[PDB]
A paper describes a structure:
Oxidoreductases, especially aldehyde dehydrogenases and aldo–keto reductases, are the first barrier against aldehyde compounds, which include numerous odorants. The two most represented NAD(P)(H)-dependent oxidoreductases in the mass spectrometry analysis based on spectral number are aldehyde dehydrogenase 1A1, also named retinal dehydrogenase 1 (ALDH1A1), and aldehyde dehydrogenase 3A1, also named dimeric NADP-preferring (ALDH3A1). In the presence of NAD+, the two ALDHs can catalyze the oxidation of aldehydes into their corresponding carboxylic acids, while AKR catalyzes the reduction of aldehydes into their corresponding alcohols in the presence of NADPH. ALDH3A1 has very high efficiencies in metabolizing medium-chain aliphatic aldehydes such as heptanal, octanal, and nonanal (129, 209, and 164 min−1 µM−1, respectively) as well as aromatic aldehydes such as hydrocinnamaldehyde (169 min−1 µM−1).
The ALDH3A1 crystal was soaked in its mother liquor containing 10 mM octanal. This resulted in a homodimeric structure at 1.80 angström resolution, where each active site of ALDH3A1 is occupied by one octanal molecule. Interpretation of the electron density maps in the active site region near the catalytic Cys 24350 led to the conclusion that octanal is present as two alternative conformations. Considering the carbon atoms’ positions, these two conformations are very close, with hydrophobic interactions stabilizing the aliphatic moiety of octanal by the surrounding residues’ side chains (Tyr 65, Tyr 115, Asn 118, Leu 119, Ile 394). This elongated hydrophobic pocket seems well suited for the binding of long-chain aliphatic as well as aromatic aldehydes such as those catalyzed by ALDH3A1, in accordance with our enzymatic analysis. The two conformations of octanal only differ in the positions of the oxygen atom of the aldehyde group. The first conformation of octanal, is hydrogen bonded with Glu 209 via a water molecule. In this case, the side chain of Cys 243 is oriented toward Asn 114 in close vicinity within the active site. The second conformation of octanal is such that its oxygen atom is hydrogen-bonded with Asn 114 via a water molecule. This residue (Asn 114) could be involved in the stabilization of the oxyanionic form of the hemithioacetal state during catalysis. Our structure likely corresponds to the step just before, obtained because of the absence of NAD cofactor needed to complete the catalytic turnover.
Numbering used by the authors:
A (entry chain B): 1 to 448
B (entry chain A): 1 to 447
The structure:
Amino acid sequence: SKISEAVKRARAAFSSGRTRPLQFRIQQLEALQRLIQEQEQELVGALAADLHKNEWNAYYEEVVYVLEEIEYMIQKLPEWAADEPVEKTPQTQQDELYIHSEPLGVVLVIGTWNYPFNLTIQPMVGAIAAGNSVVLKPSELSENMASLLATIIPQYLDKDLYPVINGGVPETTELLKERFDHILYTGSTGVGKIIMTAAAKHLTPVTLELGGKSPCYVDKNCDLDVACRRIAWGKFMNSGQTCVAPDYILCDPSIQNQIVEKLKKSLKEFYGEDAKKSRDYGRIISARHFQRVMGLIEGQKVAYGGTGDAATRYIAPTILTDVDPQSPVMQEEIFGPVLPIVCVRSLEEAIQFINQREKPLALYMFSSNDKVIKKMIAETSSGGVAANDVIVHITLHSLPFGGVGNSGMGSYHGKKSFETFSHRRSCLVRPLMNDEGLKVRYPPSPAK
Amino acid sequence: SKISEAVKRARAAFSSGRTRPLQFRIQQLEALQRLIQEQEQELVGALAADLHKNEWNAYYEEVVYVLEEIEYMIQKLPEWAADEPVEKTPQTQQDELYIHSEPLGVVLVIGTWNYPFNLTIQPMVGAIAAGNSVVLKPSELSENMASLLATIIPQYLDKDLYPVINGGVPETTELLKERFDHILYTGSTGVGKIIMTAAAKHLTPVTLELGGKSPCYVDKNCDLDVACRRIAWGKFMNSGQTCVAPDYILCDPSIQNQIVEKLKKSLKEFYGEDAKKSRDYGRIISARHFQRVMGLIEGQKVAYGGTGDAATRYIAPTILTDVDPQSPVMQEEIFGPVLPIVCVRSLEEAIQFINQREKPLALYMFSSNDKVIKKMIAETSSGGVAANDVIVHITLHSLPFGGVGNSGMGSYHGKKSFETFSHRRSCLVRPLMNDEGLKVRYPPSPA
Ligand SMILES: CCCCCCCC=O
Ligand SMILES: CCCCCCCC=O
Ligand SMILES: [K+]
Ligand SMILES: [K+]
Ligand SMILES: [K+]
Ligand SMILES: [K+]
């Protein structure tokens, strides 16, 4: 089959040794830089068609991080790839002890649809830097990016080592029967279990970047104006379709009304009075997801927004107050511009609220009290944490990005990408000469 | 069920916060130190009964590494557990960026039978240090150590947080239905896939320490007296039942008889003429494994040994010459005292031989030519590597221990154990101060 032949060619090309010299890897990374530069208008147009993005947020909210990653890993690749001496002991002082890094082989990257360029190419950048063949499976939901990547990737990258696999769920299922040396999947918690089950048949290690509801705790005593501007920004970028969007708000009921008003103000500054007329506001990816998200407003106390246009998959920025935690909008990852507010009476209540639910990909708190910050971190668990901002903690080269529990396992970005897509092999190299001090280990054992 | 309630109690204990203070973890680690000191005779007796170890190799080949790990982790725990600052950028100078380590929760350790104390308790030591509840499943095949641990662990450790689950395959299958936050399993490649499949049901991350055939390449021009004494030691310790034993030898045909003679010489020095009478020689763990290993001798050319005693599960130290790579002894992990020699005609042929097989837990090479060593490492892949020795590379605090491909995923030992049993959580803390340098990120976007 076409899928099986693609993987066969990728493994043969890996086995030829072509990816091992750093020179080759840097060239492929420089080819991706060229792709981003030459295909700028094509990439913008695909994101516009898929997600109603424009040239500005296509670059600053997605593509730029791929370029940043490429530039960083190119500059650091020789240091990362070098054998790494480690601490010795008195008994090993004449030996070499070091960590040897080597590629895993053929890596599979399964992209998702909400950031269809970054979440396909930024993982690939890492796997390329580590010397692997990298098979790509774009998500079919962002049809235009999927079609574009299938066209332009082979025009820049090695054709056998870095193939693009077209199709939807049936094709991914057949792809997942092939033998890979690592699989990185971004998407839903449920499908993560399916990926891990398929990987188990080959003992394939997996990096699973999954889902959840990223809580956003707002401290009574903080600067509600700057806090609410940042929350609005992170909740409503990409029309709410972000893996680390602040999903919902936990706040004292005594500030629910001020939070609603300052969110409204910031939203009006961002997108104007009618977000439907703003070039900076996105659309829902599909008819199914539009229907799903609209369903989450039914029966709720709408403080703002609450309408949607099925024809264009527009859902107006929506805020819900006094939300029952047991209601639909609080029982699934929203992934839409509907922001519920859940009332808690204390920090300790919020911690308990967070801890009773599955571990989220991100946890956010807004507060100028360091005791509040340290305590919420110490008593909770999440993939990552941001205090007094949203989104940004997953854009930093020094902060590995990934989940825990139902939000996923493993991480990548920056140096962690190189490690995740490598085997780190412990090496002990001794001189081959008689060592009187070793003789104590040989039998016979001392009889007394 | 007993198993359900045990894990229930362990998660309740963990969720109360009892393991979070470092002083509590150190108290538990100190209790393990006291266990090892106070239960020395009992541990030796169980290892003698299960595996025909003695007082000396019970300690120096198994238990000492657990003590070393405990002392090391106690010393380093505050530093390892500290929030770890990471590199900032021009845009994040006013921010805090750091890695926060936190326990995963309830960790399961499934032990195996060949080092039944070390491969249950040394993983546990790391998971305790990282602040987790640790459920233990000893291997049923090492019956005496399994029963001993079920008795003494709750006599020394917190009884809710660190339960011992009794039983065999059915009980392990039952246990694997429970929801854990990490599973470390040491055992066979095939069962590792079963573990990972069970883990996937709860999105449980796994550390799988599995199997394969660790090759031992012997270079034509090296000091064979030194090399063969080291190879003999690693191959025949624990009666060959070691995950990183040098499984088979690859060598030029011209040194095959020299290798045989020098192996024989070292074996007689170690164990005497009749290894059955040596206090230092082990026994096979079970009747099934005894019959399995004897079967691998069938049809082979025996240069030394080749006999066994079924009733006491003794297999004489055995060397096989001119082995066909397609024969049974070269088609499964031997895990016994049978050492096949496969002839190859160059280093390149050896590398190709190794690469056409599944990635081994360990790869060994003996050579006084650094270029030979570097080339074989460069062109192969294995969990770890030792050049000019065997075994020892998995005993060093600074060398993470684990496989790749069919020999497993993940690693532990020393600091790596603490990382493996933690969630490393990226943290960004910014001032909630208005920033004019951030406002460029907000809509409306420029033209
Ligand atoms: C900074 C690299 C990742 C940013 C793109 C969106 C991430 C969503 O999962
Ligand atoms: C501290 C070295 C590892 C423990 C010894 C046995 C390893 C597995 O057979
Ligand atoms: K390095
Ligand atoms: K000795
Ligand atoms: K033969
Ligand atoms: K602006």
